[PDB]
Structure formats: C-alpha cells, structure tokens
Amino acid sequence: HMKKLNIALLGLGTVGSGVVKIIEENRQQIQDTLNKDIVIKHILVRDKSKKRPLNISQYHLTEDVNEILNDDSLDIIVEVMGGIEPTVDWLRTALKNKKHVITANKDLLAVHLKLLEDLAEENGVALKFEASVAGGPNNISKFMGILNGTSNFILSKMTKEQTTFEEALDEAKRLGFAEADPTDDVEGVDAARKVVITSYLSFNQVIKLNDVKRRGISGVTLTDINVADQLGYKIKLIGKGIYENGKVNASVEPTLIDKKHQLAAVEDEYNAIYVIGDAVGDTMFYGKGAGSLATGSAVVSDLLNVALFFELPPHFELKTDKTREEKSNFFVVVNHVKGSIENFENELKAILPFHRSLRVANYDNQSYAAVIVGLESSPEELITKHGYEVDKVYPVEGV
Amino acid sequence: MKKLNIALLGLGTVGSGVVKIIEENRQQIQDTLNKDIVIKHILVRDKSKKRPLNISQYHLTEDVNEILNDDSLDIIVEVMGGIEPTVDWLRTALKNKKHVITANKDLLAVHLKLLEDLAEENGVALKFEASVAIPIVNNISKFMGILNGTSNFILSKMTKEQTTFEEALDEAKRLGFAEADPTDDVEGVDAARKVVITSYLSFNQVIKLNDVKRRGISGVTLTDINVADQLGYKIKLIGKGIYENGKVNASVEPTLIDKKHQLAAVEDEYNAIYVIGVGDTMFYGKGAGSLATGSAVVSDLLNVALFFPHFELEKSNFFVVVNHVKGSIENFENELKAILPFHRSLRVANYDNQSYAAVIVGLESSPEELITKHGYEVDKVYPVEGVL
Numbered sequence: 001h002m003k004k005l006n007i008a009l010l011g012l013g014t015v016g017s018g019v020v021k022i023i024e025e026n027r028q029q030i031q032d033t034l035n036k037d038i039v040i041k042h043i044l045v046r047d048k049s050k051k052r053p054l055n056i057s058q059y060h061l062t063e064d065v066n067e068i069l070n071d072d073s074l075d076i077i078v079e080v081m082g083g084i085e086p087t088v089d090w091l092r093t094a095l096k097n098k099k100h101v102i103t104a105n106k107d108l109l110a111v112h113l114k115l116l117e118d119l120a121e122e123n124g125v126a127l128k129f130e131a132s133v134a135g136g137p138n139n140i141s142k143f144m145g146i147l148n149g150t151s152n153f154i155l156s157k158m159t160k161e162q163t164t165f166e167e168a169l170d171e172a173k174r175l176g177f178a179e180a181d182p183t184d185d186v187e188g189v190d191a192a193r194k195v196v197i198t199s200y201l202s203f204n205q206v207i208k209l210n211d212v213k214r215r216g217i218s219g220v221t222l223t224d225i226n227v228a229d230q231l232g233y234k235i236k237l238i239g240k241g242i243y244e245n246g247k248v249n250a251s252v253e254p255t256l257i258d259k260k261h262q263l264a265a266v267e268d269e270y271n272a273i274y275v276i277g278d279a280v281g282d283t284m285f286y287g288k289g290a291g292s293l294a295t296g297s298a299v300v301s302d303l304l305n306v307a308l309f310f311e312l313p314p315h316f317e318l319k320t321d322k323t324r325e326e327k328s329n330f331f332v333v334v335n336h337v338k339g340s341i342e343n344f345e346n347e348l349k350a351i352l353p354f355h356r357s358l359r360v361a362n363y364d365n366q367s368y369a370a371v372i373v374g375l376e377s378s379p380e381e382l383i384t385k386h387g388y389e390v391d392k393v394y395p396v397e398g399v
Numbered sequence: 400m401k402k403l404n405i406a407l408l409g410l411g412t413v414g415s416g417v418v419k420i421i422e423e424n425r426q427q428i429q430d431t432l433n434k435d436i437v438i439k440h441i442l443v444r445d446k447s448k449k450r451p452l453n454i455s456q457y458h459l460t461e462d463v464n465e466i467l468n469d470d471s472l473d474i475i476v477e478v479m480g481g482i483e484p485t486v487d488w489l490r491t492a493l494k495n496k497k498h499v500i501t502a503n504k505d506l507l508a509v510h511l512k513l514l515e516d517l518a519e520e521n522g523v524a525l526k527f528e529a530s531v532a533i534p535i536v537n538n539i540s541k542f543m544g545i546l547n548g549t550s551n552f553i554l555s556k557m558t559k560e561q562t563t564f565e566e567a568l569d570e571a572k573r574l575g576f577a578e579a580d581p582t583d584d585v586e587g588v589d590a591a592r593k594v595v596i597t598s599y600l601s602f603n604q605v606i607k608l609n610d611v612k613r614r615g616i617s618g619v620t621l622t623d624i625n626v627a628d629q630l631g632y633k634i635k636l637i638g639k640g641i642y643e644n645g646k647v648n649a650s651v652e653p654t655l656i657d658k659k660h661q662l663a664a665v666e667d668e669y670n671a672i673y674v675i676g677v678g679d680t681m682f683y684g685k686g687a688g689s690l691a692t693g694s695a696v697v698s699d700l701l702n703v704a705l706f707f708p709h710f711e712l713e714k715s716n717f718f719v720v721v722n723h724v725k726g727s728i729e730n731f732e733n734e735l736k737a738i739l740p741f742h743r744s745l746r747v748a749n750y751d752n753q754s755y756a757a758v759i760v761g762l763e764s765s766p767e768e769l770i771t772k773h774g775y776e777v778d779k780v781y782p783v784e785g786v787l
Binding site: 021022025026029136138260261262264265266267270279280281282283284285286287288293297309312313315316317318319320321323324 | 412415416419420423424427431451452532659661663664665666669678679680681682683684685687688689690691694697698706708709710711
C-alpha cells in the first residue's frame with residue numbers, strides 16, 4: 001500500500017542538511033501516519049568530493065543538475081541552493097516537467113515568485129516558498145516593518161547604551177548579530193528585499209528591488225536618537241509599502257516612530273510587520289527571523305502538504321463593505337543656523353505650506369531639528385531655497 | 400459544475416456578511432473552481448425582522464429540523480451563537496455526515512473537543528473560526544494576552560487620563576465599548592473564555608471556564624497604576640496559560656507588566672497574544688469584525704469544498720499592597736526581608752497613608768497568607784510579569 005515519494009534536493013548547506021535530518025527522523029512516522037515513503041533520490045551539490053557527515057554518504061550526490069531534472073521518477077524538487085542564475089531556470093524546467101517545487105531560496109524576489117507561480121499553475125503542479133519568505137506570516141493599503149534584526153539591534157544598542165553607530169556595530173559583530181561585512185544589513189538591502197516580497201504578498205503587485213527607495217542606518221547618530229527621544233520618538237529602520245491608486249510606493253529608511261506606537265517597542269533582533277487596511281483595525285506580527293532549523297522545518301511542512309494534496313489568485317472580493325457602512329510627516333535637521341531656536345521656528349511657520357503641527361528642538365551647536373506633521377510632501381527643497389543647510393530628513397510615523 | 404448545497408444557521412451581521420461574500424464571489428468560485436455554492440436554507444429566529452442583507456432571495460426558515468433533515472445539504476454553516484440548543488444541532492449535522500463550519504463565539508474547549516471527535520468519527524470536517532488576535536491560524540509552554548478590549552480600554556483611560564475606575568467605566572459606556580451591565584468585560588469573563596480557547600489550541604488540553612482563576616479590573620485604582628508606573632510597570636488585565644508537567648494553570652487578572660514588554664504598549668481596545676516556547680512571538684489587533692469573520696467562514700467553506708512532528712535536537716513575582724502599617728518604609732522592608740522565604744529581589748514603595756507596596760521577585764507562591772499570619776493587613780496581591 002505504501003506510496004513512494006521520490007524527491008531531489010538542490011543544495012546541501014545548513015538548511016539542506018537540516019531538511020535531510022528532519023526527513024530521516026520523521027520518515028518512520030510519515031510512513032506510518034500517512035503511508036507515504038519519502039525517498040531522497042538525489043542531492044545536488046557544488047562539490048561531490050567534500051568531506052561530509054556519515055549520514056550524507058548514504059544519499060546519491062551529484063554535481064549535474066540535469067541528472068535530477070531528467071529523472072522522470074521524481075515527484076518533487078526541493079531547492080535550498082540560493083541564487084537567481086542559474087537557479088530560477090532550474091526551477092522553470094522542473095515545473096515544465098510536471099514536478100512540484102519547494103524552495104527556500106532567499107534571493108528570490110517578486111518577479112521570480114510571480115513567474116514561477118504562473119508556470120506551476122500552468123503545468124498543474126505546486127510551487128511552495130514558505131521557507132523562502134521566512135517568518136512574520138484581506139485588503140491591505142499599507143505596511144510598515146522592522147525587517148532586519150541586525151540593524152534593529154544596532155539602533156537599540158545605540159539608544160539604550162548611548163553608543164555611536166560605529167561602537168554599536170562593532171558590538172553587534174562581537175555578539176554574533178552582525179557579520180564581518182554587514183553591508184547587506186546596515187545599508188538596508190536585506191530589508192528592501194523583504195519589502196519587495198511583502199509588497200508582492202500584501203498587494204499582489206510586483207515591484208523591483210531598484211524601485212525601493214533605500215537608505216541604511218550607517219548615517220544615524222546618537223544625536224539623532226536623543227533629539228528624537230526628547231521629541232517623543234524612537235528611531236527604527238522601517239521598510240514600508242503604501243498601495244495607493246493602483247501604485248506601490250516602497251521604501252526602507254531611518255524613520256522616527258512615536259514612542260506609543262506598537263512598532264516603537266520592537267527592540268534588539270526582533271522583527272515586526274504592522275499592517276493597515278480598510279476598514280479593519282491595524283494588526284501586527286512580532287517575532288525573530290528564521291534560522292536554518294526553522295527554514296528546514298518549513299520546507300518539510302510544505303513537502304508534507306504537497307504529499308497530502310497529490311492525487312491561483314485568491315481575489316476573494318469585497319465590498320460587501322458597501323453593505324454595512326494620506327499626509328506625510330518629516331524630521332528635518334538643519335546646520336549652520338544663525339539666530340535662535342524661536343527665530344528658526346517662526347521662519348518655518350512662515351515658509352511651510354499648511355500642516356498639522358510643528359515642534360523644534362536643539363540638535364547641536366547652530367543646529368536645530370523640526371518635526372512637522374501633516375504636509376503633502378517633503379519640505380526639504382523649500383527649506384534649502386530659504387537658505388538653510390539641510391543635513392538630512394527622516395520620515396516620521398505613528399503620528 | 401459540482402453543486403454545493405449549504406445551509407446557514409443564523410443571519411446577523413456575520414451571517415449577512417457570509418451571504419454577501421458568497422454572492423459577489425459566486426461567479427469566480429464557479430469559474431475558477433469546480434463548484435456552484437447554493438445557499439438552500441437560512442435558519443433565523445424570527446422571519447419578520449428587517450436586516451443588513453436587504454429583502455432577499457434565499458429560503459428563510461424558523462425550523463432547524465427542516466435543515467438537519469435535508470439530505471441534499473453538504474455543509475452547515477453555523478453563525479447563530481449559543482451552547483444550547485446550538486451544539487446539539489451541530490452534533491446532529493455531523494452524525495448525518497454533514498461538514499460543519501462554525502463561528503460560534505460561545506463555544507468553549509469542551510464543546511470544540513466533542514465536536515472535533517464527532518466530526519472525525521463521521522468522516523467529515525469541523526472548521527472553527529474564533530477571532531482573537533483568527534485563533535486556529537494565530538511548541539508552546541506559556542501564553543499571555545490582553546483578550547478583552549473594553550477592560551483594556553478602561554485601564555488605558557485611567558492610566559492616560561488619570562481618572563478613577565468609575566469615571567473610566569462611565570466613559571466606556573457612553574462610547575459604546577462597555578454595556579450597561581459591563582460584568583462580562585470588567586469581571587474578566589470574556590477574557591477567561593478566550594483563555595480556555597487559547598489553552599485548547601496551544602496545548603491541546605481541555606480546561607473548563609471555572610478552572611480559570613479569574614479576577615476583574617473593578618478593584619484597580621489610580622494609586623495602583625501610578626505606584627506601578629514609578630516601579631517601571633503598566634497594569635493590564637492579562638489572560639495567561641502556563642503548561643507545566645502535564646498541567647495547565649490558567650488565569651485572568653490584573654497584572655503588572657514591565658514597560659519594555661511588548662504587551663505593555665497594547666492600549667485601548669486593542670488585543671494581543673504573546674506566545675513563549677525559540678524566540679517569543681506576538682499577534683496584535685482588535686477583535687476580528689463581522690466582515691473578517693464572514694471572510695474566514697467562506698475561506699473555510701472553500702477549503703472544505705476543495706479538499707473534500709518530531710524535531711529531535713518557573714518562579715513567580717508579586718506586587719503586594721499592605722495597609723495599616725505602623726512605622727517607616729525602611730522598617731517595613733526589613734520586616735519583609737525577615738519573614739519572606741528566600742527570593743531573588745525585593746523593592747518597596749509608598750502607596751498611601753500607612754500603606755506600602757512591595758514587588759517581590761522569585762517566590763514559589765503568593766506571600767499573602769504568610770504576611771497575613773505575621774499580623775499585617777494585606778489589601779491585595781497582583782502578579783508581576785515581563786521581569787528579566
């Protein structure tokens with residue numbers, strides 16, 4: 001009675017090894033509880049000579065991806081290799097050959113997920129990427145998230161321990177939160193990728209990485225943090241997607257967050273996605289990022305799901321909402337300002353277009369900061385043409 | 400086209416929402432899936448009443464047996480509420496080999512368990528949608544939650560606007576959050592129900608509503624709030640489930656929560672469930688509204704239509720308020736140090752005239768009886784959470 005599920009793994013790093021371990025220790029149970037026998041028939045690796053643990057030696061390792069793609073006995077391909085090229089083409093071929101695909105590929109972006117999803121539907125097979133999307137998870141109009149643990153950890157350290165960015169980054173390296181080249185984290189690239197992904201899942205719209213307006217945390221100073229603090233705000237690296245009039249506006253940047261906002265409290269390496277919609281209340285999901293074990297665990301869950309369902313636009317519409325029934329805020333830092341804080345405030349009151357509120361604060365010697373709530377657009381150019389040196393502008397949220 | 404014959408039990412806001420949703424997706428469910436959903440009957444208590452779904456085209460009945468005896472039905476969607484006679488209705492449906500989807504807010508763990516087994520036994524699906532942030536969607540050794548919007552709203556009002564409980568409750572009544580008899584909210588009953596449900600889903604253990612040690616917010620004062628504030632804590636009505644040594648200890652009560660804890664920031668009518676097991680996680684949001692509940696029902700409905708884990712490799716803190724204390728705060732502190740059993744730390748604070756409060760970290764159980772037997776007058780004790 002037992003049905004054999006022949007699978008292949010593309011890649012054998014920490015995640016692939018974890019998938020293998022998890023399959024081994026549950027094989028007996030998956031047999032007994034579900035009468036499917038999962039056989040890992042091939043594992044693609046870069047180097048077949050590498051010294052590997054004993055448990056790996058019993059599987060058939062290959063360096064030739066065509067050996068896997070042309071094996072008609074395979075039911076499912078599990079890709080944990082990473083990369084866009086040639087990896088995505090591999091998955092395309094697999095789907096065209098009527099193989100289910102499960103991927104935890106961390107480099108996939110919306111363009112890739114869309115084309116693979118359609119190709120899968122087209123060929124009557126499953127594409128699963130839960131392990132790829134990795135931790136938090138109808139009509140969402142906006143999301144804001146803390147999407148990179150290392151960056152958030154650094155800002156928390158600076159804020160709590162009153163250190164410079166440089167000191168906080170070094171400390172994060174020593175403690176294992178940041179890597180030796182931390183660029184992907186501190187320049188906001190990782191967060192930008194997650195904004196692309198979150199935008200695809202939230203809005204069913206594809207944007208490119210390069211459409212995400214991006215600024216990292218390496219220019220945030222202790223002075224920014226303490227002045228924000230005095231004004232009632234924390235500083236977070238926020239990844240944001242706003243879907244207005246059929247268009248996604250996506251960004252990642254240092255952002256002042258009102259201290260009472262749920263996101264303001266998300267500290268250290270924790271992440272969170274805050275979701276806003278019509279008409280419902282706001283929601284938020286909070287937790288750390290996935291490790292190898294959790295990613296591997298998600299892969300095997302997806303694998304079992306597809307095994308269960310062996311032998312799509314949701315577009316579940318409202319309204320419905322018919323029956324039964326967006327300004328911007330800015331933190332502006334100006335340098336080389338002669339005259340008093342009162343005079344800077346008065347000048348700002350005269351030059352700004354209409355807005356909801358204005359508060360100014362001392363920043364440094366001849367430097368002031370202003371938080372302006374309720375403008376239609378950045379006042380940066382306007383302030384610049386009135387002769388102020390604008391050091392920088394950060395958006396302000398939770399107002 | 401595969402015809403799916405369904406019946407609805409009840410037609411309030413949620414039932415009406417289910418119908419509207421389905422209507423506007425029927426064409427899509429037909430085209431994109433194999434299936435034509437026919438709402439063949441809707442049970443209502445009173446066929447005369449005016450509704451959200453306008454005057455409409457469905458067959459309304461007041462006789463539940465007309466639905467339960469209709470063998471052409473594939474799925475029963477229950478959005479009526481109630482334990483009796485509602486649960487028996489669902490039992491009959493399952494025994495007659497009908498799939499059941501329920502958004503019944505009054506069900507408790509005992510009821511979900513017996514229905515789940517009855518469903519498995521009869522080869523049919525039971526899908527349950529309760530909306531505290533959708534429970535089944537939203538291992539675990541402990542959870543802590545803010546599970547009642549009205550109670551939380553009242554504590555937030557007191558804290559932020561420095562009003563008495565009575566003033567804050569009156570303000571919640573005028574704004575529609577609290578009802579005229581607000582007992583279910585302020586006595587923590589609603590929160591306790593959600594603790595039963597959350598315990599069932601988190602731990603796969605059935606507890607009864609009466610096993611939840613429950614205290615409401617009506618005795619919380621502005622003095623408690625401000626003393627807690629100076630100590631580094633907010634006060635929340637916390638529903639809590641701790642699963643230790645095969646046993647669930649469940650409670651709902653006023654609790655001091657460290658200001659840095661994610662739960663400390665959850666204000667007004669917002670709710671949240673904080674889960675510990677592996678990093679902590681939290682889901683935050685208000686109680687799912689009718690449209691979301693109805694939306695979840697139709698998802699479950701489509702799921703049933705379409706479709707029909709070995710990964711190898713606690714002390715307590717208390718806020719105690721004592722009255723009629725003669726002598727200084729230093730002397731009270733010294734006396735407490737002498738009488739308490741071993742603990743991790745102790746801090747004392749002025750509370751009122753001849754009243755002091757203490758936060759004690761690392762006791763096995765409430766020191767209330769002990770302090771009483773040493774001749775002190777204990778006003779009350781609240782647990783303290785989020786301690787590092």
